[PDB]
Design a protein around this nucleic acid. Sequence first.
RNA 1: GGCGCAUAAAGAUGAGACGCGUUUUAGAGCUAUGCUGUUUUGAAAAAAACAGCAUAGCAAGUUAAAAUAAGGCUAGUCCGUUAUCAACUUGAAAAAGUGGCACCGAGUCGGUGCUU
DNA 2: CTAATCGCCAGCGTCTCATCTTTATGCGCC
DNA 3: ATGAGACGCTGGCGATTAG
Length: 1362
Amino acid sequence: KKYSIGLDIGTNSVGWAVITDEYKVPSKKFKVLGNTDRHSIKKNLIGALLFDSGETAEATRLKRTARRRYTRRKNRICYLQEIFSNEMAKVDDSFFHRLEESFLVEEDKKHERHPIFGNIVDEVAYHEKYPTIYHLRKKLVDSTDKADLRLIYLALAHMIKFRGHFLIEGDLNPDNSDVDKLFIQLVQTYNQLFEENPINASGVDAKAILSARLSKSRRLENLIAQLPGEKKNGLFGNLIALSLGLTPNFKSNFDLAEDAKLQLSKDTYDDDLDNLLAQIGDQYADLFLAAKNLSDAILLSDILRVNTEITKAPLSASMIKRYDEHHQDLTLLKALVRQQLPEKYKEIFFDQSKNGYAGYIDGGASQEEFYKFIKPILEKMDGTEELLVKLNREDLLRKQRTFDNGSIPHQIHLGELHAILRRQEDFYPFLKDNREKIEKILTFRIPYYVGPLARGNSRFAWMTRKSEETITPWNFEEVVDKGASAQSFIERMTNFDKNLPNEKVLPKHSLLYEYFTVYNELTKVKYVTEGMRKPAFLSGEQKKAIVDLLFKTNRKVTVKQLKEDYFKKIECFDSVEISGVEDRFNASLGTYHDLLKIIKDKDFLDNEENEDILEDIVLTLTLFEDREMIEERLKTYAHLFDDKVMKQLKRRRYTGWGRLSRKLINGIRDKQSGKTILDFLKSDGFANRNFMQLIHDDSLTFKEDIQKAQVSGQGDSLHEHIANLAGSPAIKKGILQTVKVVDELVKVMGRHKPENIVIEMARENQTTQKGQKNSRERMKRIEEGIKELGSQILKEHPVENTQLQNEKLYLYYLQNGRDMYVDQELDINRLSDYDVDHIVPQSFLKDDSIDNKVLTRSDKNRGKSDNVPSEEVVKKMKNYWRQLLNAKLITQRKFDNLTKAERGGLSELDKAGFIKRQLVETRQITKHVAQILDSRMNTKYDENDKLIREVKVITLKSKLVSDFRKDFQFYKVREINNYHHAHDAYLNAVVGTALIKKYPKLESEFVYGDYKVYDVRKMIAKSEQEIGKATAKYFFYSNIMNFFKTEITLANGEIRKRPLIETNGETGEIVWDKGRDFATVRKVLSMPQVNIVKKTEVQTGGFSKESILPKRNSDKLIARKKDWDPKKYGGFDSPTVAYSVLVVAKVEKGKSKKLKSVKELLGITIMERSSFEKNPIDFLEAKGYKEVKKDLIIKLPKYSLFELENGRKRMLASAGELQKGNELALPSKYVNFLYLASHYEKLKGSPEDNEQKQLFVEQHKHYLDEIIEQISEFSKRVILADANLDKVLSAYNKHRDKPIREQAENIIHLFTLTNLGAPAAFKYFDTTIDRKRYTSTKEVLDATLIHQSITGLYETRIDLSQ
RNA sequence: GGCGCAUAAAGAUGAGACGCGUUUUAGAGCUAUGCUGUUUUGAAAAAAACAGCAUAGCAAGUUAAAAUAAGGCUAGUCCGUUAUCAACUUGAAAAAGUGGCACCGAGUCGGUGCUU
DNA sequence: CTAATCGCCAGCGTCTCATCTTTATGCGCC
DNA sequence: ATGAGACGCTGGCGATTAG
């Protein structure tokens, strides 16, 4: 007959269920192919599709930029080698050959094994006089002697292969290179600037307080702490915060009307510096150049070497210093060990797997690991002392190539290169000719807006070519049209108007877009005069009046100002009554004020004729960033402004894009009107219809021309379209999955579309108060918080939200300057020094949000390091947390977690396997699936051009089905089996269809697409009138939900009996039977057969583990390169098997090599796949097979399902491992018992019913042993755990004395032994039960293969017996 | 169910760069002692190493080259790990085609009536 | 000397730049 | 005047052990 389908989707699952007219899952017998006995199997119409999570593209992408980094680096070496090609042949004919063959053994080496010279003695000489490359560096930079050409190549190539970062624009000539000089001159400048209050250092050592190995903010703390009376927020303090690379602000220093922050790290800093300085004047400016070179001298903190005047190669010479101290301290340490602890010398300087100096140098141990290892050994000796000091300062035997070199900019490398060259260009002519070429090799960097330099063979490129030449670091500015390329770079990512398909979108700083939003949001603000009788919308002239009076004067104008600065100045009304916007305006006109502040002429901007010029200018300031490009783009508008004005104009730049086109805003006109949308929003007379009313108006012409959108029925397959969506590819997998599953269901059920399709959405209806509370901007939540608390902490140290965005500071003002653990006063000084601690350890769940974070003096005052703050802290800070709770500062979840300690702390039950990304991903896949099905099912239109809804797509909140499981004793425990998905599907279906049959006048609100207004304001127009829908709507959801209940208890007051049918009189149809339908639910929930299928998918990705393993005597090793023998060079390991192949042939056996017939599973890896799939028989024969049955080759993906005996199923985990393929079908009694007993959801209600469920818990305690029995028969029937089941049973008997609840939680823990899929470890109390893996896939070979559909209804079975 | 705007929490995609790591090779290690081919001296007894290997005591140890998915052809200073995939029948691919209805039951579905 | 257990391991870290979603509430509308 | 909603390594591999 007729039917409906319910779905519950997730990044890992597709829960599907089919209900009928009577809410019962239909049963049907399905045909089975292959060559087995079961020709038919009667199964049910409910199950769940399981599949691996669709992966993001971040990883693949990272690998891609890496590839490009390596190819481009190799080419830089190739340019420099090519420059030396003709001359090196005159010096050494086979130098580059030996360098290119350096990796090879002498056995396979073409020329001499000695890299530089080929002979032995000279190589030894080089390694002697220049122990490192940095000695040669210093020598060639300093000395003006004609050195060897090969060495010049080595220095230059070492500089080039490892250039350094391009983070610092311009160039840094090693200026003072001392904190001292620049700071004295700087203090001099600050004192000369202000005779108002000059502050001196009074001899405080800067070059240790700024060179300290810690936070920039931490360095700043001590620095502002040196001169008392000077705030960290002070002009001096904010400036020294800027020198440390932080993000300061001088808006409170120079009292600017608007916010203005600067930062050295960002590249708009020069334009922002000219901008802000010309804004404050040419007065204060030198302070900032002083800060620039200051930071330049502070950058080489770990690499600062004595004095910069000793040589012209500071970095190289510094490395030499590291080498020297290293040598000395090494000889030192050796002497000391041989003196004091002579027996450990053999372990420290020889054993490589012990983190000794041998593990540090020859082993794989790190500097950090090394320090940890030798520290107690040093301090256990009487000498040392200073070596301990070098260890804490981290400069103990430091090597040369370490991790802190990520700080080295390319400017110093370029300096040593330019120096060697200028000092060596006097001998060789070619490098004197090409010194600028080489400098170009090191300096060249492809701009980000250009991207890959492709010639049309990349889906990632966008660059456009001015020529058609091979782009080199030398012809780059000309061959590449940087202009069109940057333009297309931003244009390839920006959207189009949804309304106007072929049209682009205005920038977010578009004057037309800003006018759009001000007028659209200002077209409904209604006014009621103290004498007025009815609200009346602002008139056409009035809107414009407001705009000109306030919106063009202030950055943003508040409603208090409109009432006080307009109505009293214009209407001169005693009192005002505004009916459209609260507190302040959403829309604003920022671009206009930026402009009026730059060009300083209102008349031009106010002019309408200029809007094309203006819009082109904003578009230009948005598409580009490069000063030259922007400056060139505005040469056409240079006749309208002064040169000084053109500078000010190019300095301002904008980012972002709107949502609508220009043709939509001020372009499309109406036939009867002749005016555009912008005009209508600006004036429509009596009815100031909004944007949405304008679009949806038969009275206007717009709806007619928008219906002309695009064409939905164009060439788009049932796929493609899913893979053509926006966002991450992680979603496309889930969507395709759920739809192909649905299509299979309809293909089964009478080939006609079902009545309804219900899905569950993650969107639930919060209340108004909570929605505004979680969403309060930071100064808001803080200010409301401290005003409620009453502290004058805001009065002692005031900062706006602009400089408040730092984490530990937000926590600091959130907690009112008091530690959440210690009950002490926190300090603004050691801020990054204070620790930010997670409430619930990072071991349980991943949360970086503030609901989980807390600022403390030390994180050890938390109590335990692996749990919610100890009861010692909770029972001493409960008052402060509750008081922090009354200030609306901390959340409910935070107080619950801080108090969860006294509730029982954290059990292993709080597994929390989710990552927020799986949640927004589920939201993405659900929002997408909902509107796809809504259109795949509804195809036809009526006679009045409106779509036919044969099937309705329904959106159910999670809260409804959830509360439905909770208010009818229908609980869910996921870890039991994967049926809870199908249960969610069934419940969503039943609740949905029963719901639309119960109350149809409001059904338009739930279905996707169509809707009736049916305003809920008018629904519960109570005398209280809380408003905001939200609050009204949640109350509406519970209100509609209780009509489904059996007994009605009100939070409003009194009680009410419910009709046992609760059918609707208008329908005249029984909507629900309170006596028999719950029983079909009871059966369904207790139903054994549920079609659970894991998507048999071929593994793809990386070829193998990336870790390069050493030479080894194994066949397990993979050639890293072609000729590179893994037995002599080392190679890869652990290849990932794409898919297993079933083969049958003959192999050799014994010394006589006799051919016996064998069949087995061959492991086909990814790297091998293209080659196997090309010539398969040839590949198998090469593997070592002979006479292979080609038609007896079965392709088996991962998770290939298999069955042997007593319903025992196994899934193909690999070519040599299997997975548990059975689900524990457990009756409802045990499930619900486990729920109530384990305390899964704190089962809040009325204390009475809590004790009743408790009594039921205390009574059916035999359920424990019975459950143990289900698991036992089930483990003995399928799992074959041998020892593990025994360890479990022994463990259950040992803890039979434990409280009931715990036994319930850990019995819950035990299900993982019976869980579907790969076998993983678990615990019962402290007894860790590791996993019993199936290491041989031999039993699969003569079992019964089950090829299954996506819903597992159409099964084809194969008797592996041939 | 849907837009726009403001605030907020969580995510996504693409591009340009650095720094490590790892892997082979180059950085003539030395001395005493055991096994071995011989040569070499010797009347023999007994060693001189020409070298390879095993055992103790010291010496040093920081650097470099090259590789960083195998690779691919379209040969770009490009591309190569995301999405796609049960089985079966046609197809090079794309894609199309392939599985009867009620009832009594419910341990991974069974049984019975109907009908090809 | 097999063959199943046991025990172990997995490329990482940073910076610059640009465009996109997804929910929740608030101010208007289909 | 609400808590759930998102889900959770595991397959290669070498050495240790048991027969």
